[PDB]
C-alpha cells in the first residue's frame, strides 16, 4: 500500500502555510522591566486585515526605553480597539478594553483573550475570532489562576501570565457559510494546502484504509484507537462517544 494523504501532510513538502501575506508573528510584546513593575503606554497607529486569520491585527507602536527607537509590535485586535487609542500594558496597567494585563492583577470573573500559556510564550490562548477566556478562579497563594477555557477546559495558569483585556474581534466570523466552493477555495488558498478533503471511501483501497469495495462502503469500524499507529489512525480517532451530542 502506498502512502495515505494525511501521512504525506506531515512531510511538509507542499502543505506549508502560504505565509506570503502573513503580517508577521502575531504575538504579544515580550515581558520587560517596564511591565514587570509598572506599565507602558503604546499607540495603535493603524490596523490591517491579516491574511488567513479572521482576527484583524491591532498593530501597535511601543517606545523602546533602552535605545531611542520605536519597537514595533503587533497585537490581535480585541473588540472596541481602534486606531489612535493608547494601549496600556503591564502589572500596573489600568484594566480597560484593549489593555494587556498580567493575570494576577485582573479580578475574578473577567473576559480576557490572547493569553500566555506560560510567561514568555507571547500569548497562545483564544487567539481565534470571537473567542475569549473567562477568569473563573484565583489562587494567589500558589501563584495560580483557574480559567474557563474556550474548549470548555479548566486550566490552571501561573498568575504571572498575561492576556489582553477584551474579546478577539471578528465575532460571528463563521456565522454565514462560505456558501460556495470558490468562497472556501479563497479561504483556504490563503492559509492551507488542505482543501479539498476528498472522502476516503471513494479511494481505491491502496489510497486510503477505508477505500475500495464493489459497494462504496467503509467496511471496517470507523473508530480507531489512540494506540493505533500512523497509517491506521485515519478516520474516526479515539472516539470516546460517537453519534449526536447531548445523547
Amino acid at each position: 500500500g502506498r502512502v495515505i494523504r494525511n501521512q504525506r501532510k506531515g512531510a511538509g513538502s507542499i502543505f506549508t502555510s502560504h505565509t506570503r501575506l502573513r503580517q508577521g508573528a502575531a504575538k504579544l510584546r515580550t515581558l520587560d522591566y517596564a511591565e514587570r513593575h509598572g506599565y507602558i503606554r503604546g499607540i495603535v497607529k493603524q490596523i490591517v486585515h491579516d491574511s488567513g486569520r479572521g482576527a484583524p491585527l491591532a498593530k501597535v507602536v511601543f517606545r523602546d526605553p533602552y535605545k531611542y527607537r520605536l519597537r514595533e509590535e503587533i497585537f490581535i485586535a480585541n473588540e472596541g480597539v481602534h486606531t489612535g487609542q493608547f494601549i496600556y500594558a503591564g502589572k500596573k496597567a489600568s484594566l480597560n478594553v484593549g489593555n494587556v494585563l498580567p493575570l494576577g492583577s485582573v479580578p475574578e470573573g473577567t473576559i480576557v483573550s490572547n493569553v500566555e500559556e506560560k510567561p514568555g510564550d507571547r500569548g497562545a490562548l483564544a487567539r481565534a475570532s470571537g473567542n475569549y477566556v473567562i477568569i473563573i478562579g484565583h489562587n494567589p497563594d500558589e501563584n495560580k489562576t483557574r480559567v474557563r477555557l474556550p474548549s470548555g477546559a479548566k486550566k490552571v495558569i501561573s498568575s504571572d501570565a498575561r492576556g489582553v483585556i477584551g474579546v478577539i474581534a471578528g465575532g460571528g466570523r463563521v456565522d454565514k457559510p462560505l456558501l460556495k466552493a470558490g468562497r472556501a477555495f479563497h479561504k483556504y488558498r490563503l492559509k492551507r494546502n488542505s482543501w479539498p478533503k476528498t472522502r476516503g471511501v471513494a479511494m481505491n483501497p491502496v489510497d486510503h484504509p477505508h477505500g475500495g469495495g464493489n459497494h462504496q462502503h467503509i467496511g471496517k469500524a470507523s473508530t480507531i484507537s489512540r494506540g493505533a499507529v500512523s497509517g491506521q489512525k485515519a478516520g474516526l480517532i479515539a472516539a470516546r462517544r460517537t453519534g449526536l451530542l447531548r445523547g
Partner: protein
C-alpha cells in the same frame, strides 16, 4: 547663573529613555567563560567528598609569607647560571684535578611530583608544598594521606604561580625542600611546627568530614526566609 538650568531627566517607568547603567550582570559571556564559571559553582553545590575540600582549607597569607620567603632563599639554579657553573666545573675537574666536588653541595627545592614523591616514600623530603588547584585534581588527591601516613610535613598552598616562580618554571603543582642549612633550619622548624598545627593534627577529622553543598545567593536567601518564618 541664568544659563545653567536644572532639568532632571525622569527615568521612571514609561518615561524618557533610561541611561546606560552597568549591565555587567547581563553580559553574554563567551561560552567558554560561562562553562568555566559554573564549574566552580558546581564544585561547591555538590556534596564534596572528604578527600576533596581537604584543599580550600589552606595556609594563611601571613604564614605563606615566610614560607615563600625561605624558599626564595632556597631557589634552584637555572641553566643560565649553570653555564658558568659547568664552565668552572669543567676547568677545575680537568686541570685542577679536584675530582668532581669542585662545586659545593647544591641546595635547591626539589620539584616535580614524581621526584618529590620519590623523596616522600624515602622520607628524605623535609617539607612538601602542594598547589591546591591542579587540573585534574586527581594528580594530588592521594598526596595528603600519602604524606600523612609516613609523617612528612605537607602543606597545601594556593597558587601554582608562586611555585613556578620559585622554581623558575611556569607551574610545578608541587615543591619540596630536602636540604636546609643550619641557619635556615630554625626558621624551617618554626614553619613545620606551625603547619603541623594546621593539617597534621586535624587530618583525621578531615578524613571523615564532608563538604560542598554551598547554596547560591537565591537558594540560600530563600531557604533562610523559610527558616526565618519556620
Amino acid at each position: 547663573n541664568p544659563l545653567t538650568h536644572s532639568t532632571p531627566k525622569n527615568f521612571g517607568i514609561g518615561q524618557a529613555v533610561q541611561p546606560k547603567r552597568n549591565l555587567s550582570r547581563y553580559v553574554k559571556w563567551p561560552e567558554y567563560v560561562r562553562v568555566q564559571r559554573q564549574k566552580k559553582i558546581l564544585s561547591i553545590r555538590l556534596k564534596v567528598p572528604p578527600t576533596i575540600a581537604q584543599f580550600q582549607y589552606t595556609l594563611d597569607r601571613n604564614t605563606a609569607a615566610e614560607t615563600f620567603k625561605l624558599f626564595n632563599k632556597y631557589r634552584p639554579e637555572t641553566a643560565a647560571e649553570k653555564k658558568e657553573r659547568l664552565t668552572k666545573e669543567a676547568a677545575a675537574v680537568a686541570e685542577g684535578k679536584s675530582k668532581q666536588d669542585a662545586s659545593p653541595k647544591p641546595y635547591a627545592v626539589k620539584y616535580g611530583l614524581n621526584h618529590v614523591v620519590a623523596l616522600i616514600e624515602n622520607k628524605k623530603a623535609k617539607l612538601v608544598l602542594i598547589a591546591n588547584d591542579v587540573d585534574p585534581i586527581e594528580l594530588v588527591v592521594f598526596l595528603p594521606a600519602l604524606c600523612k601516613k609516613m609523617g612528612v610535613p605537607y602543606a597545601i598552598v594556593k597558587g601554582k604561580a608562586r611555585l613556578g616562580t620559585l622554581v623558575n618554571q611556569k607551574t610545578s603543582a608541587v615543591a619540596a625542600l630536602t636540604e636546609v642549612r643550619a641557619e635556615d633550619e630554625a626558621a624551617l622548624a618554626k614553619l613545620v611546627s606551625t603547619i603541623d598545627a594546621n593539617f597534621a593534627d586535624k587530618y583525621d577529622e578531615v578524613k571523615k568530614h564532608w563538604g560542598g553543598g554551598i547554596l547560591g545567593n537565591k537558594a540560600q536567601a530563600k531557604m533562610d526566609k523559610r527558616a526565618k518564618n519556620s
